[PDB]
Structure formats: C-alpha cells, structure tokens
Amino acid sequence: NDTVRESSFYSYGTDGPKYCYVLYNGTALKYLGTLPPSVKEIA
Amino acid sequence: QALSHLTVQLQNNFQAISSSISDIYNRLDPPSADAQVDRLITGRLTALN
Amino acid sequence: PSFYSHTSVNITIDLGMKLSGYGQPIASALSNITLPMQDNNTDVYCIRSNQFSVYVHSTCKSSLWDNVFNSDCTDVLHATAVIKTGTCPFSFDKLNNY
Ligand SMILES: *[C@@H]1O[C@H](CO)[C@@H](O[C@@H]2O[C@H](CO)[C@@H](O)[C@H](O)[C@H]2NC(C)=O)[C@H](O)[C@H]1NC(C)=O
Ligand SMILES: CCCCCC/C=C\CCCCCCCC(=O)O
Ligand SMILES: *[C@@H]1O[C@H](CO)[C@@H](O)[C@H](O)[C@H]1NC(C)=O
Ligand SMILES: *[C@@H]1O[C@H](CO)[C@@H](O)[C@H](O)[C@H]1NC(C)=O
Ligand SMILES: *[C@@H]1O[C@H](CO)[C@@H](O)[C@H](O)[C@H]1NC(C)=O
Ligand SMILES: *[C@@H]1O[C@H](CO)[C@@H](O)[C@H](O)[C@H]1NC(C)=O
C-alpha cells in the first residue's frame, strides 16, 4: 500500500493504490507499477 | 485486394533498419538517415508504379 | 514505470597530432580512449542503471615525428574528438534520444 525505495524493504511490515515490486532477497529489485483497476487475467 | 496489398506494402523495410522514417531520423545522424530513407523511397515508388 | 537511477558515462579521448612534410596535420594512431572505471578496469563498461547519458571529453597534444607528446596543440594542429556511426545501426549523438 506504500511506495518502497529501490534495494529497500517495506517499512510498516488495505484500501487504496497498490505498488507492486519484484523481491530477490527481501529488497526491492524492480518496480512494476501500480495495480490497474481492470485486471482480468494473469498468464 | 488491390488496396489491401498497396496498404500492406508500407511495412517493407527494403533492406533498411526500419520501415518508419521517424524512427530512422530519431536513431541516426542525417547523413546516414538520408541513405536509409532513399531505399524506402525507391521501393514505395516501385509499388506505386 | 520503473525505478529512477541515472548514470553518466564520460569518455575521455586524448588525441596526438603532428605536422607532416606536406604541411598538413596528421592525427596519431596512438590516441588513447579512457572509459569510466568498472570492476577494477577501464576498458569495458556496461550500463547497470535504468537511465544513462553519454558525454565525450577531448584533449589534444602534439609531438614531432617521435611519438613523444609533450606540447599543447597549436592553432593548425588543434583538433576535437568526435564519434561517428560507423557500422552501428544507431549514432552516438542519438543515444540520449530515448
Ligand atoms: C597514450 O598512452 C600511451 C601509454 O599507454 C602513451 O605512451 C607513453 O608515453 C609516455 C610519455 O607520456 C612514455 O614515457 C611511454 O614510453 C609511452 N609508452 C609507450 C608504450 O609508447 C602515449 O603517449 C599516450 N598518447 C597520448 C596522445 O597521450
Ligand atoms: C498481482 C501481481 C502482479 C501485478 C503486476 C502489476 C504491474 C503492472 C500492470 C501494468 C498495467 C496492466 C494493464 C492491463 C490492461 C487494462 O488496464 O485493461
Ligand atoms: C499502509 O498501511 C499501513 C499499515 O496499516 C499504514 O500504517 C500506512 O499509513 C498505510 N499507507 C498509506 C499510504 O495508506
Ligand atoms: C540477504 O539479506 C540478509 C539481510 O537481510 C543478508 O544477511 C544476506 O546475506 C542476504 N543474502 C544474499 C544471498 O545476498
Ligand atoms: C562526468 O562529467 C561531468 C561533467 O562533464 C560530471 O559532472 C560527472 O560527475 C562525471 N561523471 C562521473 C561518473 O564521474
Ligand atoms: C581492486 O583493486 C584494489 C586496489 O586498487 C584492491 O584493493 C581491490 O581488492 C580490488 N578489488 C577486487 C579484487 O575485487
């Protein structure tokens, strides 16, 4: 629910924008963006 | 079919890096860009003929 | 969307010039190219950030038919380093064009 800095971890660890990341060793490696409201399938 | 073929002929590279003139001018210096664009010009003229 | 991380790549080109017997400036093949230091070396540089920019810094020196560059280039022997496309599908000056 909050932006995570590069090579960092979530600070506070429900309703609002969600920022998605790829984690390798508990640290943010790639930023994927916000979750769009119209996701219908993930392959 | 004739119009369809004429329209689809615009995707031919004609031995160039790209079929988009804007991409060529955004990726290359003008001296090389002109040489790249000349091939597309010739191919499109042949298709029109 | 992506992370923001910018890297500047400075390429240093040291040129050697001389005067030929016909009165024309000749650029020596002993000119040196220096890349930013990476992994304890300065000959290969790979981009490891999301965004990058490229810059060229040129220096000029002169010798007298002895490959001993110890004097600054004069008005006749002054030269500037440039990078041309060659065989690449893109030019160096267009690398900063997204
Ligand atoms: C490019 O670098 C080379 C060395 O890699 C320089 O050649 C040396 O020059 C010094 C004096 O600056 C001499 O004492 C050495 O004997 C030279 N070494 C060799 C192997 O020739 C060269 O001068 C540099 N070129 C320019 C234009 O700066
Ligand atoms: C749920 C875990 C993975 C989430 C990944 C989210 C990252 C990027 C999403 C990009 C936008 C997708 C848009 C799909 C098209 C549409 O909006 O209909
Ligand atoms: C995200 O959730 C945590 C835990 O409830 C909360 O402390 C924080 O304020 C939230 N952040 C935002 C931007 O809403
Ligand atoms: C992962 O991070 C931990 C600290 O959170 C560190 O001790 C460990 O060495 C890291 N592992 C790798 C494989 O880098
Ligand atoms: C490259 O040179 C510029 C000035 O031209 C300087 O500000 C910058 O820090 C240099 N980059 C590196 C990585 O040293
Ligand atoms: C790089 O070289 C330095 C000395 O210049 C040395 O201390 C260091 O260990 C080297 N790095 C390596 C081997 O990863």
Do A and C touch, counting CB pairs below 8 Å (3 needed)? yes
The tokens 């004097």 sit on which residue? C71
Q: How far, CA to CA in Å, does C60 sit from each of C17, C34, C48, C52?
A: 7, 14, 31, 27
A34 contacts C1? CB cut-off 8 A: yes
Best residue among C13, C14, C18, C30 to mutate for probing ligand 1, ranked by most atoms within 8 Å of CB: C30
N-term to C-term CA, chain A: 24
What six digits make up the tokens of C22? 């016909």
Q: What's the rounded Cα separation, in Å, for the pair B27 and B17?
A: 10
CA distance linking residue C71 with residue C36, whole number of Å: 26
Method used to solve the structure: cryo-EM
Coil/strand/helix, residue A34: strand
Q: Which of B20, B25, B28 to mutate to test the interface with C (most CBs of C within 10 A)?
A: B28
Q: In sequence order, which residues have a C-beta less than 8 Å from that of residue C45 and are 6 or more positions away?
A: C9, C35, C36, C38
Contact criterion met (CB below 8 Å) for C36 and C10: yes
Angle at C95 between CA B37 and CA C55, to 5 degrees: 135
Asked if residues C23 and C68 have their Cβ atoms less than 8 Å apart, the reply is no
Q: Is-contact B28 B7, C-beta < 8 A?
A: no
In chain C the first and final C-alpha atoms are separated, in Å, by: 14
Resolution, in Å, please?
Answer: 2.3
Distance in angstroms (rounded) separating the CA atoms of residues C35 and C71:
24
Please give the distance, rounded to the nearest whole angstrom, from the Cα atom of residue C7 to the centre of ligand 5: 9
Helix (H) or strand (E) holding A39: none
Strands C25-27 and C32-34: unpaired
Other C-beta atoms lying within 10 Å of the C-beta of residue C19 = 16
Question: A7, C70, C93: which is closest to B30 by C-alpha?
Answer: C93
B28 touches chain C (CB under 8 A): yes
Is-contact C59 C80, C-beta < 8 A? no
